[PDB]
């Protein structure tokens, strides 16, 4: 219908503006923090988040041209593999950097003595290599299971195929069900429940301590915290909820296709999540006064 076509075109323009603003913002943040700023734990986390967002955004036009004509991949198997691995790695990277930034801010606010004594650059690197390792562990299913297949009608889509792993159609279908359920629950728990619980608790304790100590000279800190939490929620929760609904309804969708709304709802939610990945440095880095001074000096 007319509304459905608009609902399909909207993710395309959302991803285009996501690509543009992500490229510009991540480039500026990298140029200022990495080269024109002194190394700092907060600066290090911001640089890692911006690098993840830029690496995701660099391959985002591939996702744009894939969603333009319905998941079709004009490129080869290796290039689709690389693009998907990069997108997956950078998405878990952005989520885990958001969670770790929340944890670091909570540690600095609640325990300033420990942050002053122990939060160092070398320790920052030693604890920041961890989220990337977790991203690789959560992405390895893309490393092995994801392949490229061609429909006999002529169209090609590089998605999960289990001909070699299953060895038989029944075993392949069983392995598909098992891996899809495991990936869905893992994404919901570690990718969404783990950081959202961390982000809400970490920023919740920060606001509780600031309000208790009477450090609220202006509404700007509370406004920034509320904006961060609200944006992260209203962007990631829709996509994660859609993915969880598709996972719990795996058999119904695969065998009978009872729930078709998820099929047309993944794209807007994915576009919203990618827009959140785009806007993360806008309210995580640009809010800092020193960063603005360095940018206007550059």
């Amino acid at each position: 219908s007319a509304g459905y076509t608009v609902l399909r075109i909207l993710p395309l323009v959302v991803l285009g503006v996501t690509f543009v603003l992500g490229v510009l913002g991540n480039g500026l943040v990298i140029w200022v923090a990495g080269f024109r700023m002194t190394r700092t734990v907060t600066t290090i986390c911001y640089l890692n988040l911006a690098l993840a967002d830029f690496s995701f955004t660099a391959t985002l036009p591939f996702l744009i041209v894939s969603m333009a004509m319905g998941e079709k991949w004009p490129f080869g198997w290796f290039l689709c593999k690389l693009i998907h691995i990069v997108v997956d790695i950078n998405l878990f990277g952005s989520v885990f950097l958001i969670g770790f930034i929340a944890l670091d801010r909570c540690i600095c606010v609640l325990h300033p003595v420990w942050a002053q004594n122990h939060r160092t650059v070398s320790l920052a690197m030693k604890v920041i290599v961890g989220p990337w390792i977790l991203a690789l562990v959560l992405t390895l299913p893309v490393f092995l299971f994801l392949t490229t297949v061609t429909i006999p009608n002529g169209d090609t889509y590089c998605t999960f195929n289990f001909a070699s792993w299953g060895g038989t159609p029944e075993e392949r279908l069983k392995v598909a069900i098992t891996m899809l359920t495991a990936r869905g629950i893992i994404r919901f728990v570690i990718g969404f429940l783990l950081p959202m619980s961390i982000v809400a608790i970490c920023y919740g304790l920060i606001a509780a301590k600031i309000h208790k100590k009477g450090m609220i000279k202006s509404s700007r800190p509370l406004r920034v915290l509320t904006a961060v939490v609200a944006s992260f929620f209203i962007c990631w929760f829709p996509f994660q909820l859609v993915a969880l609904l598709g996972t719990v309804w795996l058999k119904e969708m695969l065998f009978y296709g009872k729930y078709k709304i998820i099929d047309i709802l993944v794209n807007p939610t994915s576009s919203l999540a990618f827009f959140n990945s785009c806007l993360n440095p806008m309210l995580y880095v640009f809010v800092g006064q020193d960063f603005r001074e360095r940018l206007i000096h550059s």
Binding site: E71, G166, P169, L173, F192, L254, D263
Partner: peptide, 16 residues
């Protein structure tokens, strides 16, 4: 986190 890709070993329904 992870892009939503849905398929089986061979048909599935997904959205990029």
């Amino acid at each position: 986190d992870a892009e939503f890709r849905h398929d089986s070993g061979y048909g599935g329904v997904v959205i990029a």
